[PDB]
């Protein structure tokens, strides 16, 4: 707090009524400020949960809840569809995966608490976290579950008046809880998955065999909780683990870890590349820290650019602002949401 004026160009703190397990900036941006929006959720103790859209004023600081949609159970994860960001998929504490078009719901929820999702996606037997929309195939959604499977739905092929969709494909390569799943940015047929079986799997949707991946690799010495593909370097990705490390990978040679990022004091739950800078990656978890890494400083640890110490509880999720370089939203288990940007002098050196 004392050093915040020197460590940050922006630090905004907000206490939500209930904690959010998820955070994702919507891509739209609309005075000496602009309005940005976040997809958030609730995590309650036996009370009505909501899918939430919040607004944030950012300089060219007020945070307000714009929309609350009745949701059945806590929102494990919520992700918007790139081709139509009004469409949001959510992971529930039951098996169903839900889809909402927030323009077709009131801004104020009915106190009856009726969850009326636009689609209920069936296929899983248990809850999960991993959720990914295909940026090259509109409406193709991947989901990871504690039932050890990956489901795929094609939302573009659902009947217009249909409210329930069965999984198009179920991928059964893992032998334990599948923690995360992500499509490649460029190859419409490629996606990666990570699981408690300590493996990273690379899948080709053009393959006739849904029980065997294109590549299976022993990624970590503990559960693998997250993955992220580099949006500038098509062959590169990162994984985060209960190992307390982030691993760096090349799709052309997955049997050899390129690098291991070490600083976290506990389990890592989220890893995300910067949307603006190819060598920048961030990671978060149970140690209540969000680390920012710079690949270009490897060997000069030297690759640790910044440690965000604003949270005093486990970090559940974070999201890089797609419109404002170096702005991050991070959320923790103690109801705190932070919107922050490290000092320009830190990344300009």
């Amino acid at each position: 707090k004392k050093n915040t004026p020197f460590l940050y160009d922006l630090v905004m703190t907000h206490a939500l009524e209930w904690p959010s397990l998820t955070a994702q900036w919507l891509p739209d941006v609309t005075k000496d400020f602009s309005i940005h929006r976040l997809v958030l959720g609730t995590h309650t103790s036996d009370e009505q949960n909501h899918l939430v859209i919040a607004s944030v004023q950012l300089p060219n600081g007020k945070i307000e809840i714009e929309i609350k949609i009745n949701h059945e159970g806590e929102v494990n994860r919520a992700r918007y569809m790139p081709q139509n960001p009004c469409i949001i998929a959510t992971k529930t504490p039951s098996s169903d995966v839900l889809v909402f078009d927030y323009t077709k719901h009131p801004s104020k929820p009915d106190p009856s608490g009726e969850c009326n999702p636009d689609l209920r996606l069936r296929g899983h037997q248990k809850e999960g976290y991993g959720l990914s929309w295909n940026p090259n195939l509109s409406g193709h959604l991947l989901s990871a579950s504690d039932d050890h499977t990956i489901c795929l739905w094609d939302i573009s092929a659902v009947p217009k008046e249909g409210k329930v969709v069965d999984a198009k494909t179920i991928f059964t390569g893992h032998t334990a809880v599948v923690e995360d799943v992500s499509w490649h940015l460029l190859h419409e047929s490629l996606f990666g998955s990570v699981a408690d079986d300590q493996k990273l799997m690379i899948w080709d949707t053009r393959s006739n065999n849904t029980s065997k991946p294109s590549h299976s690799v022993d990624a970590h010495t503990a559960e693998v909780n997250c993955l992220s593909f580099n949006p500038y370097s098509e062959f590169i990705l990162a994984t985060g683990s209960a190992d307390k490390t982030v691993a760096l990978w090349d799709l052309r040679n997955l049997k050899l870890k390129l690098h291991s990022f070490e600083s976290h004091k506990d389990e890592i739950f989220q890893v995300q590349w910067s949307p603006h800078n190819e060598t920048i990656l961030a990671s978060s978890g149970t140690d209540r820290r969000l680390n920012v890494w710079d690949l270009s400083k490897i060997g000069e640890p030297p690759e640790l650019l910044f440690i965000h110490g604003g949270h005093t509880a486990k970090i559940s999720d974070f999201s890089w602002n797609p419109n404002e370089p170096w702005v991050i939203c991070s959320v923790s288990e103690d109801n705190i949401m932070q919107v922050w940007q490290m000092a320009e002098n830190i990344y300009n050196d």
Partner: peptide, 14 residues
């Protein structure tokens, strides 16, 4: 396993 059992309620309604 990934989430707390007793999420706390803060005294606000937004």
């Amino acid at each position: 396993r990934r989430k707390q059992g007793k999420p706390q309620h803060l005294s606000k309604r937004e």
